[PDB]
Write a protein that holds these residues in place. Structure first.
Motif, PDB file in Angstrom:
ATOM      1  N   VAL A  14      11.342  -6.925   0.088  1.00 42.36           N
ATOM      2  CA  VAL A  14      10.294  -6.447   0.984  1.00 42.36           C
ATOM      3  C   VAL A  14      10.338  -7.215   2.302  1.00 42.36           C
ATOM      4  CG1 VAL A  14       8.630  -7.946  -0.210  1.00 42.36           C
ATOM      5  CG2 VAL A  14       7.833  -6.101   1.175  1.00 42.36           C
ATOM      6  N   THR A  18       3.523  -4.966   5.581  1.00 44.80           N
ATOM      7  CA  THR A  18       3.315  -4.205   4.351  1.00 44.80           C
ATOM      8  C   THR A  18       1.896  -4.401   3.846  1.00 44.80           C
ATOM      9  OG1 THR A  18       3.722  -5.701   2.502  1.00 44.80           O
ATOM     10  CG2 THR A  18       5.670  -5.006   3.742  1.00 44.80           C
ATOM     11  N   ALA A  32       8.295  -7.567  -4.553  1.00 41.63           N
ATOM     12  CA  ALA A  32       7.306  -6.473  -4.668  1.00 41.63           C
ATOM     13  C   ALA A  32       7.692  -5.582  -5.848  1.00 41.63           C
ATOM     14  CB  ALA A  32       7.260  -5.682  -3.385  1.00 41.63           C
ATOM     15  N   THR A  41       3.633   0.090  -3.617  1.00 33.97           N
ATOM     16  CA  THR A  41       4.111  -1.286  -3.631  1.00 33.97           C
ATOM     17  C   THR A  41       2.907  -2.201  -3.791  1.00 33.97           C
ATOM     18  OG1 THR A  41       6.050  -0.801  -2.258  1.00 33.97           O
ATOM     19  CG2 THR A  41       5.298  -3.090  -2.342  1.00 33.97           C
TER      20      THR A  41
END
Ligand SMILES: CC(=O)O[C@H]1C(=O)[C@@]2(C)[C@H]([C@H](OC(=O)c3ccccc3)[C@]3(O)C[C@H](OC(=O)[C@H](O)[C@@H](NC(=O)c4ccccc4)c4ccccc4)C(C)=C1C3(C)C)[C@]1(OC(C)=O)CO[C@@H]1C[C@@H]2O
Ligand SMILES: CC(=O)O[C@H]1C(=O)[C@@]2(C)[C@H]([C@H](OC(=O)c3ccccc3)[C@]3(O)C[C@H](OC(=O)[C@H](O)[C@@H](NC(=O)c4ccccc4)c4ccccc4)C(C)=C1C3(C)C)[C@]1(OC(C)=O)CO[C@@H]1C[C@@H]2O
Ligand SMILES: Nc1nc2c(ncn2[C@@H]2O[C@H](COP(=O)(O)OP(=O)(O)OP(=O)(O)O)[C@@H](O)[C@H]2O)c(=O)[nH]1
Ligand SMILES: Nc1nc2c(ncn2[C@@H]2O[C@H](COP(=O)(O)OP(=O)(O)OP(=O)(O)O)[C@@H](O)[C@H]2O)c(=O)[nH]1
Ligand SMILES: Nc1nc2c(ncn2[C@@H]2O[C@H](COP(=O)(O)OP(=O)(O)O)[C@@H](O)[C@H]2O)c(=O)[nH]1
Ligand SMILES: Nc1nc2c(ncn2[C@@H]2O[C@H](COP(=O)(O)OP(=O)(O)O)[C@@H](O)[C@H]2O)c(=O)[nH]1
Ligand SMILES: [Mg+2]
Ligand SMILES: [Mg+2]
Ligand SMILES: [Zn+2]
Ligand SMILES: [Zn+2]
Lengths: 62, 426, 430, 426, 430
Positions: A14, A18, A32, A41
């Motif tokens: 990742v 996010t 993740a 996620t």
């Protein structure tokens, strides 16, 4: 294998900006989870807090 | 004069036989080149027992080296004592056994067996008075567990009267270095219970136990285990290579210790064994040799003798000692441990004494014991086999060589028969 | 004596071989151009000529010329026999039908001819080391076409494979599921033990252990070469427990079709980290059983181990292997099937691991390569067939395949076969 | 004949035993390397009492060294006389007692009790005619107070007829070095009263008093206290190691000194003791030795005897002295001090005379006294115990190991019973 | 054998550890780079690797990268294992909820893996040395998270915990009372011996005895390191009365929850002062018991001593010790509980104290560390909860905590729990 709430969770690398699908906070680590059906996620710390696969995927289709 | 034919099979058997030749060439004062260099005449008096004389006063061992791969042959021949064997005696193929019993017994080395017996026949005919055969192999894997037993069957068929005396390293659960050991062991002991007259069961777990808790070696290799096994191998044949107060041939050992025909699976041991840091503190006299020799820790099988009773036991002492002393200790141990001996045999202990102890030692004592507790070794392997054969796992490899499942069933049937026989008298 | 034939197919296989023979040349001290300055340790992989030149026992094949044009021009141009570097004219274009039926058809008779000539130089040949990729057009079609002939011409000889397998998220082609699903018939019928490998697993391993943020494919190749070198070390060197190549399969394979083990290597470690820890036998043994170190993106904890081969190399004492395996057994995380109470095959070799001078992997006195037949890999297939099902439902890209001489039904017959294979790994799991 | 098996437990017991071995090795003329280097034959006449003979004319102590930390064993092993011991009897754990009696008796030491008893069996079997056991420990702390009593119970069970003879350093109020000493002492003495036949009380307070007022040491270390204890330790066993006019085996001591079964807790003492700057001034003659020997300061327990009376006294003289003189002095002492002796025993004094004094001295006198005043030692610790147990302080550490407050109550009950028995006759 | 794991959490804990490992390396003669120029005295704290390098048994954790980045660049860069120096991404921001629930939950699975691998090396592990601060966000939340995991993974092993505690007047943060009151659960339920210390007392100490008007935090850390070194001196060295780490607690802890002794050290003195005064055993023994020498700003005369542990190190003899404690009993100021007539545990070690070359502490032949469970520490809690009650009455700062996954009611349950502890320390005082 693993159906805590009802779907697969496989490691993903990742990067960038996010958000968790449950916390709605930002993930700091380079790890993740990811359900290829739900397309989400999570932190690795909220895996049991989610809804079942059916709920999330039927939600995703709004 | 009571000559012995020596055979090796598989990697373990070849390595242990190589270390055995180490030990007994050191005992007889034989140089690596094969030239005699010993001190005393008694070394030369019975040199014919293990070695053929050759011109130039050379001595060549009566060893037949059999293995289905060239790797171990190259290992021994390039070893510290590889030049000493006869080049003709290296009988070997190319394709390995693949740890498959059927490959050894039926398909691949069944071709080589005809070459093996022809060399063994030459060695046997070169001898003056053959006493028996001594074979080294391992019951795990496919090279030893199949080829050694097929060779045992053939030699038994040709030499029905001579004694057969095999040394067998055989599996243990926590020291398992192969997945299919239960199948190979169950298939090979099915013959060993029939053809062989004695079988010296050995186990890596007990060897490592002695290497740790008694010898206190930090990093024991397989070389040390082979050394320990070769110690007992040299000890048992001591009575027919040196003088003594009480002489006991291998046939005499078999007559005393084998009560019924099929209870011939042996448990060996050795004394003294000391860590180097503690040897200066011990006394080597008869009493403490006797104490350590009957210790449960000192036996080469994982089975604790306290879970059973001894049918018969043999003590081969070497050194200068009192006969009165040895008799008194062998009475005392049997009396104070009377619960651990079958009471339908009035006397369970057999004693022999030779006058020539191992070099660097003032005294030694080789232990052999026929105990019902050995059944625990034979139960466990069967209990492992039942785990696999009930679902036919790994059976395609064996049945590809023409093998059948009926032979597996009959082998396990003979296993349960043998363990039942050992349990019956306990 | 104890020779092995190493065939390399596809770009992935050819580059893996370019790394692998690089590793072997350093191992046996052979110069990159084929001479040896100053045992028969090299006899397994290299045939010796009267001029002092060691020619590898290899065959490089690709239906496009680019990669084998590179190897014919690189530093190892002088190593290989010129006519075993076989090239076609037309790239397979990532299509099983081309590689199997149409363009790989023409070049097969020359490839088997060179394999025959290599075989005739052997005295004690043992098996085949085929390197290829599941996704590639040539890496599926050509390997199937070649193996269908090899299984009938040299049927008894064992056949070992090293395959790069499609990943969960990393993917470089769209019809990878079709190509793999078609390679399944080869890997089922005309194989004996094939090692899956995944790019993303090694990527994560190199990120975490080696501390390199962004590796190339050469880094992956320099670990796959290390694994295959660990496999063949027992064949090229002396050891305490030398494991034969058929003994290897007899331990690994419980059932005729259950032959797809995982592979992993330890200690995968950088040079800087290695100075601060000891790397005992127990530590490296425990390293193999973590999910962090598997080379296929699947959790071993979601299945049951069936058979594990631990190939130790270097300064390893068997005491330590015993103590380590006992420690592994007492753990309740590492679960084995009920019907294999033995479990572990052990081999020990006295040759330490060799470091490639330009490589990243540190020098270590010990190494352990762990190969595990386990049920968890079934989930790796349960992934990939589900990728197939979405596409074939639409008949998505089928026209390219059927247009090149392929039967349509072969798709369904392929999808059925894996449904039998994925069943079996579950069926034995009870 | 009359071999003694000796054991060490806990830090204090190990230290005193280590000094005790050095002292007697000086007496017997044994080098630190275990080789004999003495002058007289009488040293070698009864060397077997404490030492096993080993090859090369070496002599190894018959010592079992026990602990739950390796630190004390590392200290002893690297000490002045560490090398003399046999490495095998260095039986030790890894996690310590934590000054917890329950840890010593039930949890940690319970696992090692099997290991120590096995070595004790070897040492006892090597003996020709074993007389008794000789244990050194301390009642404070967790190693000694628990493990010494556990091992005493076991050895008493396996050897019910042999003498159990322990030397115990035990708490005092003003010289306490551990908070939980009363609990541990109360639990330990509950076992010592039942099992042992002779227990020799020792107090650090009285030893410091000896060091300050009698020896006039400016800075006495624990080495000096161990020296003082080791002096009486060697003195008591003198009669079975050297010849004498009146030989008194430890059994003969026990018969005279224990009028009733449980009143066996003894107060030791030594003479002569002088400052190194005034020894030129003293006359060592028997009356002066007698006077210092019966002085209240001279005894190594804090209990002043003048608050009690003597049941029995044992004077083990050493050297060449006049028997009539010894009898005269020992009569006049008990006559002119009649109020401090029980009148229902017509003669309260046992006398033994060995012909060999300690090295460097011309004459010596070891003192043992079974006195009612020892109740003060047994009643003070209880008043400490009653202070803590009334509020259950520190009991969670003990009850975490499976212990119960019921055993505390029974231990205190037995303690007050013992105090009542000692008081009933005063 | 006899090992200990030293975990350092928060900025305060990390810097105290930086002082402590500086004190140990000089005490055992280990270079800052981990080598030893020339007895297993170092075995308790250092693991020994075959290159002749000693790696400390420690785990450094801080959720912001700054302080450990200083540690990774300072002189002790080469001492620590690079992977056991753990750093997060986001600062805890002085918030218990962020350390416990939100941010530290990501790194807990890594720190536990580090601790597990350290423990697997340890053959005779005893317990843990946790260094942290109550005021800090990490030093409260992360220690609460970690102690709960250690109390289930290693429940039998001891857990010694070292603390900087909020002072009466000196303070650096506004919500220190909240963090402390939340940390109290951790100290109560999953700890065996927690050693309180505060900055103000050590400041006043440096003002009076060390004659420095205005010291930094390094001066305080160089005394906390001396205290812990004195505690472990019996473990790393030979002595007349070696005090085991469990014996230590068995003499310190009378009840399950009363486990918060004060700590103090003597003779704290400047290099100029010591020449004018002898520093015999009696005077240093007296020096422990004045109110001036306590490391927590409380008056011992206000509370009854319950248990004392005097750890002497250096040229000390038991005669002088017994003489000194005779006088300390003889006093009417050094009061004690009626139910503990022994009171004093004594340990003696032969190693004198080590002086750091740049320190402002004098060389002395003798040192004594007095660690005392006493009721007076209850007053220190009676302070800090009153700081809580004013703020929690208004819900003064609460929205930050509740914003990060913290239940509001846990505040009251914390205030409730301390109301039980301060009661207990008073209830035993009768
Ligand atoms: C001064 C002294 O005591 O030396 C001993 C010795 O230290 C000890 C520890 C030896 C020593 O043995 C070992 O270290 C050893 C290690 C692994 C496995 C087996 C042995 C010794 O090496 C072994 C060696 O034994 C022999 O030489 C025997 O004749 C033996 N032959 C060989 O070991 C041998 C070595 C190299 C090449 C060829 C033979 C033998 C044993 C059985 C039957 C016939 C011969 C001896 C006396 C010693 C040493 C040298 C230290 C011990 O061995 C034997 C067989 O006596 C191990 O415990 C015993 C007791 C001994 O006290
Ligand atoms: C010229 C002279 O008189 O020398 C004496 C001596 O001066 C005095 C003071 C010695 C001396 O003892 C001490 O100074 C001492 C100090 C601390 C603790 C214990 C003793 C002496 O050290 C002690 C030593 O004693 C012995 O040798 C005994 O045999 C003793 N063994 C040991 O002390 C010993 C020391 C080191 C290693 C091994 C043994 C002993 C006691 C009981 C049973 C068996 C043996 C002797 C002769 C003296 C000195 C040397 C000054 C005294 O000791 C004994 C036991 O006799 C202390 O008061 C007595 C009376 C002696 O007069
Ligand atoms: N680890 C590794 N994988 C490679 C390498 N080169 C190609 N691959 C993998 O191989 C897969 C794709 O297969 P292809 O490259 O098409 O193999 P191919 O046989 O040449 O296929 P065609 O070009 O159509 O003939 C992908 O998963 C790639 O990641 C390499 O150098 N190292
Ligand atoms: N003696 C000493 N105390 C320190 C030091 N550094 C911080 N402190 C004390 O620690 C208290 C504050 O704790 P914090 O510094 O916030 O601990 P923290 O875990 O890093 O806080 P977060 O960054 O929010 O996680 C204050 O009372 C400081 O005085 C130091 O180096 N030495
Ligand atoms: N004592 C000893 N045991 C060995 C040796 N080599 C192998 N072994 C053990 O004996 C067993 C024999 O198996 P192996 O010889 O490899 O199979 P085979 O060659 O087909 O008979 C191994 O599984 C090992 O456990 C050795 O050199 N000495
Ligand atoms: N005479 C003497 N007394 C000691 C010595 N060492 C400790 N002591 C004292 O004896 C008691 C024994 O306690 P200790 O052995 O340390 O605890 P344990 O190891 O759990 O048995 C101590 O409290 C001390 O008062 C020593 O070396 N000599
Ligand atoms: Mg291509
Ligand atoms: Mg911070
Ligand atoms: Zn989340
Ligand atoms: Zn889902």
């Amino acid at each position: 294998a693993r159906y805590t709430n009802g779907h697969l969770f496989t490691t993903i690398s990742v990067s960038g900006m996010t958000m968790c699908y449950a916390c709605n906070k930002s993930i700091t680590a380079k790890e993740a989870l990811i359900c290829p059906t739900c397309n989400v996620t999570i932190h690795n710390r909220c895996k049991d807090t989610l809804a079942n696969c059916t709920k999330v995927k039927q939600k995703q289709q709004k | 004069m009571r000559e012995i034919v020596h055979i090796q099979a598989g990697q373990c058997g070849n390595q242990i036989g190589a270390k055995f030749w180490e030990v007994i060439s050191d005992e007889h004062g034989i140089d690596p080149t094969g030239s005699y260099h010993g001190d005393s005449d008694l070394q030369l008096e019975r040199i014919n027992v293990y070695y053929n004389e050759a011109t130039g006063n050379k001595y060549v061992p009566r060893a037949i080296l059999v293995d289905l791969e060239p790797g171990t042959m190259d290992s021994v021949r390039s070893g510290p004592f590889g030049q000493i064997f006869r080049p003709d005696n290296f009988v070997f193929g190319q394709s390995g056994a693949g740890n498959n019993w059927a490959k050894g017994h039926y398909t691949e080395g069944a071709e080589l067996v005809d070459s093996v017996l022809d060399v063994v026949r030459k060695e046997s005919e070169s001898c003056d008075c053959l006493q028996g055969f001594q074979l080294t192999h391992s019951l795990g894997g496919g090279t030893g567990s199949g080829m050694g037993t097929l060779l045992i069957s053939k030699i038994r068929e040709e030499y029905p009267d001579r004694i057969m005396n095999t040394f067998s390293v055989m599996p243990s659960p926590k020291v398992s270095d192969t997945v299919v050991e239960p199948y190979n062991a169950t298939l090979s002991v099915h013959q060993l219970v029939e053809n062989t007259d004695e079988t010296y069961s050995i186990d890596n777990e007990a060897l490592y136990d002695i290497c740790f808790r008694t010898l206190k070696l930090t990093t024991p290799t397989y070389g040390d285990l082979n050394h320990l096994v070769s110690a007992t191998m040299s000890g048992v044949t001591t009575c027919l290579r040196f003088p003594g107060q009480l002489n006991a041939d291998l046939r005499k050992l078999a007559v005393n210790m084998v009560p019924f025909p099929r209870l011939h699976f042996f448990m060996p041991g050795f004394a003294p064994l000391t860590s180097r840091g503690s040897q200066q503190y011990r006394a080597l006299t008869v009493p403490e040799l006797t104490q350590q020799m009957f210790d449960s820790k000192n036996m080469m099988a994982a089975c604790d003798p306290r879970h059973g009773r001894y049918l018969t036991v043999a003590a081969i002492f070497r050194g200068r000692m009192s006969m009165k002393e040895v008799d008194e200790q062998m009475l005392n141990v049997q009396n104070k441990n009377s619960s651990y001996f079958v009471e339908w045999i009035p006397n369970n202990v057999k004693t022999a004494v030779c006058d020539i102890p191992p070099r660097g030692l003032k005294m030694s004592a080789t232990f052999i014991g026929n105990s019902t507790a050995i059944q625990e070794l034979f139960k466990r392997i069967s209990e492992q086999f039942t785990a696999m054969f009930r679902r036919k796992a790994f059976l395609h490899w064996y049945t590809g060589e023409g093998m059948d499942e009926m032979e597996f069933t009959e082998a396990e049937s003979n296993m349960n028969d043998l363990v039942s026989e050992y349990q019956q008298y306990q | 004596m104890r020779e092995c034939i190493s065939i390399h197919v596809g770009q992935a296989g050819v580059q893996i071989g370019n790394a692998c023979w690089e590793l072997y040349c350093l191992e046996h001290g052979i110069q990159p151009d084929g001479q040896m300055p100053s045992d028969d340790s090299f006899n397994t992989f290299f045939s010796e000529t009267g001029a002092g030149k060691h020619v590898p026992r290899a065959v490089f094949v690709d239906l496009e010329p680019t990669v084998i044009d590179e190897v014919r021009t690189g530093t190892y141009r002088q190593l290989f026999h010129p006519e075993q570097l076989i090239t076609g004219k037309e790239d397979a274009a990532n299509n099983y039908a081309r590689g199997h039926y149409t363009i790989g058809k023409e070049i097969i008779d020359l490839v088997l001819d060179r394999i025959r000539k290599l075989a005739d130089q052997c005295t004690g040949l043992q098996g085949f080391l085929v390197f290829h990729s599941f996704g590639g057009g040539t890496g599926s079609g050509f390997t199937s076409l070649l193996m269908e002939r090899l299984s009938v011409d040299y049927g008894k000889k064992s056949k070992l494979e090293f395959s790069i397998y499609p990943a969960p998220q990393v993917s470089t082609a769209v019809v990878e599921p079709y190509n793999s699903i078609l390679t399944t018939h080869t890997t089922l019928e005309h194989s004996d033990c094939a090692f899956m490998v995944d790019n993303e697993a090694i990527y994560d391993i190199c990120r975490r252990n080696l501390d390199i943020e962004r590796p190339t494919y050469t880094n992956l190749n320099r670990l796959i070469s290390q694994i295959v070198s660990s496999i063949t070390a027992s064949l090229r060197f002396d050891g305490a427990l030398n494991v034969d190549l058929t003994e290897f399969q007899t331990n690994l394979v419980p059932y005729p079709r259950i032959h797809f083990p995982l592979a992993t290597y330890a200690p995968v470690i950088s040079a800087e980290k290695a100075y601060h820890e000891q790397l005992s036998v127990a530590e490296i043994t425990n390293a193999c059983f973590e999910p962090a170190n598997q080379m296929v993106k699947c959790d071993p904890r979601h299945g049951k181990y069936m058979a594990c081969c631990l190939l130790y190399r270097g300064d390893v004492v068997p005491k330590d292997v015993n103590a380590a395996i006992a420690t592994i057994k007492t753990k309740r995380s590492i679960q084995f099937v009920d019907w294999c109470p033995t479990g572990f095959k052990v081999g020990i070799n006295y040759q330490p691991p060799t470091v490639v001078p330009g490589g990243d992997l540190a020098k270590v006195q010990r190494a352990v390569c762990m190969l595990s037949n386990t049920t968890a890999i079934a989930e790796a297939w349960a992934r990939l067939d589900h990728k197939f099902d979405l596409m074939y439902a639409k008949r998505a890209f089928v026209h390219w395949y059927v247009g090149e001489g392929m039967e349509e039904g072969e798709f369904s017959e392929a999808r059925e076969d894996m449904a039998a294979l994925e069943k079996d790994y579950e069926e034995v799991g009870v």
